[PDB]
Design an enzyme around this catalytic site. Structure first.
Site, short mmCIF file in Angstrom:
data_model
loop_
_atom_site.label_atom_id
_atom_site.label_comp_id
_atom_site.label_asym_id
_atom_site.label_seq_id
_atom_site.Cartn_x
_atom_site.Cartn_y
_atom_site.Cartn_z
N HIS A 79 0.82 -1.23 0.00
CA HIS A 79 0.00 0.00 0.00
C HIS A 79 0.86 1.29 0.00
O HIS A 79 0.37 2.36 -0.41
CB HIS A 79 -1.04 -0.01 1.13
N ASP A 94 -0.48 -7.53 1.49
CA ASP A 94 0.13 -6.22 1.69
C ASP A 94 1.60 -6.40 2.03
O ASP A 94 2.04 -6.28 3.18
CB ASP A 94 -0.64 -5.44 2.76
N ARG A 105 -13.45 -8.47 16.52
CA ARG A 105 -13.17 -7.04 16.61
C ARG A 105 -13.31 -6.32 15.27
O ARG A 105 -13.44 -5.09 15.24
CB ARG A 105 -11.79 -6.80 17.24
N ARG A 153 -15.88 -6.85 12.52
CA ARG A 153 -17.15 -7.28 11.89
C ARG A 153 -17.20 -6.57 10.50
O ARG A 153 -16.90 -5.38 10.39
CB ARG A 153 -18.36 -6.83 12.75
N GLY A 191 1.93 6.62 9.26
CA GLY A 191 3.37 6.80 9.05
C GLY A 191 4.24 5.66 9.52
O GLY A 191 5.44 5.64 9.23
N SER A 238 3.27 2.36 8.89
CA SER A 238 2.97 1.24 8.00
C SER A 238 4.15 0.87 7.11
O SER A 238 5.01 1.70 6.85
CB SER A 238 1.67 1.49 7.24
N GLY A 239 4.27 -0.41 6.79
CA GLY A 239 5.41 -0.92 6.06
C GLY A 239 6.50 -1.38 7.01
O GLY A 239 7.30 -2.27 6.70
C1 LIG Z 1 7.00 14.94 6.54
O1 LIG Z 1 6.57 13.66 6.01
C2 LIG Z 1 5.33 13.28 6.33
O2 LIG Z 1 4.59 13.92 7.04
N1 LIG Z 1 5.03 12.11 5.70
C3 LIG Z 1 3.83 11.34 5.80
C4 LIG Z 1 2.79 11.64 6.67
C5 LIG Z 1 1.68 10.82 6.74
C6 LIG Z 1 1.57 9.68 5.95
C7 LIG Z 1 2.61 9.40 5.04
C8 LIG Z 1 3.72 10.23 4.96
N2 LIG Z 1 2.55 8.24 4.22
C9 LIG Z 1 1.74 7.99 3.16
O3 LIG Z 1 0.86 8.77 2.79
C10 LIG Z 1 1.94 6.65 2.49
C11 LIG Z 1 1.66 6.77 0.99
C12 LIG Z 1 1.16 5.48 3.11
C13 LIG Z 1 -0.37 5.67 3.14
C14 LIG Z 1 -1.11 4.92 4.25
C15 LIG Z 1 -0.60 5.17 5.68
N3 LIG Z 1 -1.37 4.39 6.63
C16 LIG Z 1 -0.85 4.07 7.83
O4 LIG Z 1 0.25 4.44 8.21
C17 LIG Z 1 -1.73 3.23 8.68
N4 LIG Z 1 -3.01 2.89 8.26
C18 LIG Z 1 -3.50 2.19 9.25
N5 LIG Z 1 -2.61 2.03 10.27
C19 LIG Z 1 -2.78 1.17 11.39
C20 LIG Z 1 -3.42 1.65 12.53
C21 LIG Z 1 -3.37 0.92 13.71
C22 LIG Z 1 -2.66 -0.26 13.78
C23 LIG Z 1 -2.00 -0.72 12.65
CL1 LIG Z 1 -1.11 -2.20 12.72
C24 LIG Z 1 -2.05 0.00 11.47
F1 LIG Z 1 -1.31 -0.40 10.42
C25 LIG Z 1 -1.46 2.69 9.91
C26 LIG Z 1 -0.19 2.62 10.70
C27 LIG Z 1 -0.68 6.64 6.05
C28 LIG Z 1 0.47 7.42 6.07
C29 LIG Z 1 0.37 8.81 6.11
C30 LIG Z 1 -0.91 9.35 6.22
C31 LIG Z 1 -2.00 8.49 6.26
N6 LIG Z 1 -1.91 7.16 6.17
#
Ligand SMILES: COC(=O)Nc1ccc2c(c1)NC(=O)[C@H](C)CCC[C@H](NC(=O)c1ncn(-c3cccc(Cl)c3F)c1C)c1cc-2ccn1
Lengths: 238, 7
Positions: free
Chosen positions: A44, A93, A161, A163, A186, A188-189
């Site tokens: 992703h 993923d 958790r 549904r 931030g 993720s990965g």
């Molecule tokens: C100065 O530089 C910055 O400010 N850089 C910056 C800031 C924000 C983000 C970003 C880069 N990255 C992205 O936009 C890339 C393209 C990835 C897109 C999806 C990513 N999702 C997640 O990180 C994310 N989605 C769900 N979870 C989650 C929640 C609970 C437990 C668990 Cl186990 C979970 F994985 C996470 C950690 C995400 C990342 C950002 C924003 C929104 N979503």
């Protein structure tokens, strides 16, 4: 990371910060060194990334402030996304970045072990999620690498958790029933590293969740054990 | 290490 603490330099030497250059340079995602030219991260992360030319991988970093124009990085030769991948919530993923140059191993940067076929059965009581991500749902990327110890949860418990979702055996969940400690935007990965017999294993890749650190909402991770054959396939190709 | 990736 929500409810975590600053990491100590050299604590998670497999952790990398995956940066993008277009439009401006910024942290994108977390990742893990698994080989001397291989980074394991989430599929992703590359949504809309049309070229590996805009990617930079930084190893041996505690603070994002260590990254400047003069900071050395690893360029990305190739982005290998699992070909069954549609979205984080449906699974698969997982992505491999083949680096243009070799990572020289040392005390600041080294690989994490992959889970063994026999390790599919083992329990794991010492798991940690790491990253530079948000500390709360609406926030900003943190300078210092944060860490949080998270307990693993059964697929059965994770399914109650979530549904309306299908929690597959290719997914692994982690979280406290009351929330408080978790991954957030931030992170993720990045890795879900579990210590077993004084050896750290890459049990999961931070994938998805509903909000961050919410009660009765475990974090969903790619279950790396279920992709050992696929990692070996793509990295050990003749 | 347990699982081996070629250098
Ligand atoms: C100065 O530089 C910055 O400010 N850089 C910056 C800031 C924000 C983000 C970003 C880069 N990255 C992205 O936009 C890339 C393209 C990835 C897109 C999806 C990513 N999702 C997640 O990180 C994310 N989605 C769900 N979870 C989650 C929640 C609970 C437990 C668990 Cl186990 C979970 F994985 C996470 C950690 C995400 C990342 C950002 C924003 C929104 N979503």
């Amino acid at each position: 990371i929500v409810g975590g603490t600053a990491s100590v330099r050299g604590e998670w030497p497999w952790q990398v910060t995956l940066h993008t250059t277009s439009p401006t340079q910024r942290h994108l995602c977390g990742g893990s060194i698994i080989g001397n030219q291989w980074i394991l991260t989430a599929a992703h992360c590359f949504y809309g990334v049309e070229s590996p030319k805009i990617l930079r991988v930084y190893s041996g970093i505690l603070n994002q402030s260590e990254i400047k124009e003069d900071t050395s990085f690893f360029g990305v030769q190739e982005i290998i996304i699992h070909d069954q991948y549609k979205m984080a919530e449906s699974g698969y993923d997982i992505a491999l970045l083949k680096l243009e140059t070799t990572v020289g191993y040392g005390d600041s940067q080294r690989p994490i072990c992959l889970p063994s076929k026999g390790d599919r059965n083992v329990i794991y009581t010492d798991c940690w999620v790491t990253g530079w991500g948000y500390r709360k749902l609406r926030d900003k990327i943190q300078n210092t690498l944060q860490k949080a110890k998270i307990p693993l949860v059964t697929n059965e418990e994770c399914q109650k958790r979530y549904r309306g979702h299908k929690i597959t055996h290719k997914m692994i969940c982690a979280g406290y029933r009351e929330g408080g400690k978790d991954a957030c935007k931030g992170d993720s990965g990045g890795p879900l590293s579990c210590k077993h017999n004084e050896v750290w294993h890459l049990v999961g890749i931070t994938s998805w969740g509903e909000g961050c650190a919410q009660r009765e909402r475990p974090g969903v991770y790619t279950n790396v054990v279920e992709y050992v054959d696929w990692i070996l396939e793509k990295t050990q190709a003749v | 290490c347990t699982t081996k990736i070629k250098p």
